[model samples]
Target: SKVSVAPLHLESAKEPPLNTYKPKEPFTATIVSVESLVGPKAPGETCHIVIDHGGNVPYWEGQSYGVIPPGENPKKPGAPQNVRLYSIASTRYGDNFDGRTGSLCVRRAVYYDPETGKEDPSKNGVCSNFLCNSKPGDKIQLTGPSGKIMLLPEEDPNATHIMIATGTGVAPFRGYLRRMFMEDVPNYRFGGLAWLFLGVANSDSLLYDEEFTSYLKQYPDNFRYDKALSREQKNRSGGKMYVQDKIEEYSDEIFKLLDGGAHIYFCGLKGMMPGIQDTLKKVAERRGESWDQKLAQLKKNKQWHVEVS
Candidate 1:
C-alpha cells in the first residue's frame, strides 16, 4: 500500500522567545544522590539526581534548569566548560520546591563512530557525563526556569489535551499529568480526552509505567495510553515503527481530536519533529486537503505546539 505524506503548514504560531533568553539569576547546588530507573543495557538510563540549594529562586512546573561545570582556565576563570538543560521532573510542592533545589531526570546518549563501529566512552556528553561521574557532595552550577511550553489551561471548563512523547521527552508531561490527576486541582478536571503516546525500545525502557497505568485504571474512559515498542514487537512487517508511525495509524482519531478543539503537545528528539510534521501532512493529504493549510490553521488556533531541550 502506498502511503501519502503531507507537509505541515504552521499558520500563526506564537513566536517563541528569542534564542537570547537568559536566566536572571544563577545559583549553586550539591548533588545529593543518583538513582537509575532502568537497567544499563537498555537504550537509555534515567538518572534521578537531587540538588540541595541553600534557598534561592522558585521554579514552576514545565520549567527547566541548566547545569554548568565549575572551574576554568586561569585566563577564563569564570568561564564554564559546558551547560546542560534538563526539564524539572519534580513538582512545585515536591522535595525540591524552591528553584534553588530539586531533582532532574538524566538520560545517557550513546554514539557510534561510523568508521569504527566501536563505543567511545571517552566521548562523554556534557551533562550526562558530569552527572554520571559525580559523587555525593559535588557542587554543580544551575540557572533558569525559562521555558514557555507550560500546560496551564485557560478558563475552559471543557478542554481536551493530547500529549505525545518518547524516551526522556516524557519528563514534562509526567509532571503535568501528576498535577492534574493526582493532585486533582479544582478547575483542572481535564474535560476532554487526555491521551498520552509513549514510545520506547522495550518494556524496561518504559519509565513511569506503573504510575501511568494507575491513571488509566482510574479513568479508563477519559485517559488512554498507546505504547510503541520499536525493537520488541509481535509483527516484523510493521517495520521499525516510531511514534510518528503510530500517530498515522490513528489519523482518524487524531483528526477528530484536533477538530474538536483539543490541544496537541509534542516533545522528544529534534529529529522526530520533521518526521511527525511529514506524517501529519500525509494524513491531511490523504483526506484531499492541503496539509500546509491545515497545519497553519492549527497553529493559528494555538491547537498545536512543541517544546524541546
Candidate 2:
C-alpha cells in the first residue's frame, strides 16, 4: 500500500559529513534515549538508541558506529574489548533530524537451543546486548561513524534506489527514507523512487512502521515498502513469506527499474543471497538479460551493494 504526497525533487538532498572520530581517539557518548520496537511477545527484542556525542561525531547515512562495551571480561579479560560495528539508523540530521545526535537500531542478540529450551545468554552477542540494555543516563565508548561502501548517490538526483533488508538490516534504509522524503541534499530534491523490500518475522518486529507508512502516504508514487513476514505472513504457495519471493512476485517492476538504471542494495542475512540471486536471475532470463553479467556491471558501476551478516 502507498499514499500520495506532494511530489518532490532531489535537488537539495545531501549526504552526511564524513566521520571524524577515530578509534585511536574515541568519543565518550551518552545514551540520550532508548525505545524498544518489539516486546516480549514479538519473538525478539530491538531498541532504537539515540546517543549524544556532544554534536561532534558526524555520520553519513551508510556509515556505522563502533560500540565499545563497558567492563569487558570472560572473552578477553584485562585486555581491550573488541568493538562491534552497527549501522547508523538516523540521518545526518540525527534522530530528531536536527544534526545533534545519532542512533542505532540494535536487535538484542539471543540464540535458543533445543537442549536448553530457552534463550541462552552464553550465545548472546556482546555488543548487541550492551546496546539493547543501555539506559538513558548510561555512557558508552563510541568510535568512527565510518565507511563509504553504502553511501547513497547524493549527487545523482535522477537515480533510483532499491533497498532490500531483513530485521535490523533496515537500519540504513531508515536514514535513506528520511533524507529522501523529509530533507534535501545539495543540488537535489529526490526526484527518483525509493523502494524497500523488508523481511521481518511479524508486524510487531516492523521497525519504524508508522514513519514509513507516513512516508508512503506522503509520496506514494516515489516510494514503495514491501514486507516479507516469515512467520506471520504467507507466500503465494502458502509458505513462509520470504524476501526472495517478494522480489519475484514483483519481478516486472524490478526488471523495469534495473533496466532503467536503478541501484540495488542488499542488507541482512548472507543465507538469502543464493535465493535472491536466483530469483533475480530468473527475472533476468525472462527479460533476455543475464543476471551474472548484469550484476557484475552493476557492481562495477557502483549500483549494486550488499551488507550481510
Candidate 3:
C-alpha cells in the first residue's frame, strides 16, 4: 500500500530555559548515587552519578549542569574553583522516575605530568574526580541547565533522530531515548526512528550498553544502535573504527534521512569535529554533491545539532 506522509518538521521554535542558578548562588544539591559505567578493561574511570535536586532546578533533555568543585584555586587565592559543565544523562523524571533528580555521565579526568612522565594525582580534574568519588550524602554546588543545541524534537513524535556519540557524550542521547522509549508518559508516544551510533575503545568501555540493548529488543522498529569499537573493528581503509566511520558505512541511508528532514546530532570529544566533517565531506563529494552547501542548508533549517566537548 502506498501512503503519503507529511515531511517531518522538528520543533525548533522552543526557547530553552537558561541559567536558573548561577555559580555564585548555585543550588545545593545532594548525591543520590554514584555507579561505575565502565569495566576493569576500560582506560579511565567513568561514573553515572545521580543528583537529587528535590524538583527545584528542572532541566530538559540535552541540557547541562555546572558543578562547582569545593576547593579554592591555588593560583587565585581565596577564590572558588571554576565550574565544570556535564551533560545530563537522565530524563526530566530522572532514573528513579521522579521529577526531583537528574544524572550525569562523568569520566574521571586524570592528567599525566609531562615533567615527571607519570600520572599525577594533583592534576586530576576537580569537578569530575569530585563527582566520581561522591557518596550518597555528599553535597554539591550546582548551577545552570545550560544549552539548547542537542534538544530532541519532542513536539514531533514522528520526527527522526540520528544521534552520534563517543564515550560519555552519549549522556544527552540516553535521556532522549529514555523519554522516547522507556517512559510511559501521556501525550508523548514516539512513532519515529531513533538511530544511535556510539563509539568507544571496546565493548567493556561502552556505557549504558545493557539499557540501550534492551531498547533495541523492546522497540525494534523505532530504535537502532550501531557501535564503533576502535579496538575491535576496522573501517574500509583499515583504520580504527570511529563513530564517523560507522556513519559513513550507512551514509547512503543517512543522507536520505537528512533529505527527508531527519535531525542529526553529534556529541563527543571536540577532537572528533575534524574527522567527522572530513568524512561527511568525502561522502557528499562521492555522491557528486557539495558538502559545504549541504551542511549550510542543514544548519539553516536547524536540522544539524552539535555539542562536542
Q: TM-score of every model?
A: 0.81, 0.90, 0.93
Model 1 lDDT, residue 22, Cα: 42
- lDDT of each residue in 1-309, candidate 1, tens digit only: 111111111112234222232433356678877778685557766777777754343455566778775545335766655556887666543343333456677887666687987868766465686776678899877776557666445446467778888888887777767655665344345555678888778888887789899889877877888888777764335687678877877878898788788888887777677878898888888889998898889889888868764
* Shift of residue 270 alpha carbon in model 3, Å: 1.3
lDDT, model 3, position 94? 83
lDDT of each residue in 1-309, candidate 2, tens digit only: 222222222123354455566655678899999889985567789899999876678766878899877675566788557778899998777766456688999988898987967888988888889888888889888888777778888657768999999888899999888878876544347878899999988888888888888888899989889999898888998999999999989889887887788899888778888999999998888778888898888888788888888
Model 1 whole-model lDDT (C-alpha atoms): 0.69
Cα lDDT, model 2, residue 124 = 87
Report the C-alpha lDDT of model 3 over 1-309, residue by residue, as the tens digit: 111211111113256668999987999999999999999998788999999998777887899999999879777989988889999998877887767789999999999867976998888888899999999999999999899888777767899999999999999999999888887665567899999999999988999999899989988999999999999899999999989898888988998999999999988888877988988899889989999999999999899999987
Better of 2 and 3 by lDDT: 3
Which ranges in model 2 have alpha carbons more than 4 Å from their true place?
A: 1-19, 73-75, 184-187
TM-score-wise, the better of 2 and 3 is 3
- lDDT leaderboard ranking: 3, 2, 1
Candidate order by TM-score, decreasing, is: 3, 2, 1
* Overall lDDT per candidate, in order of appearance: 0.69, 0.81, 0.88
lDDT of 3 at 232: 89
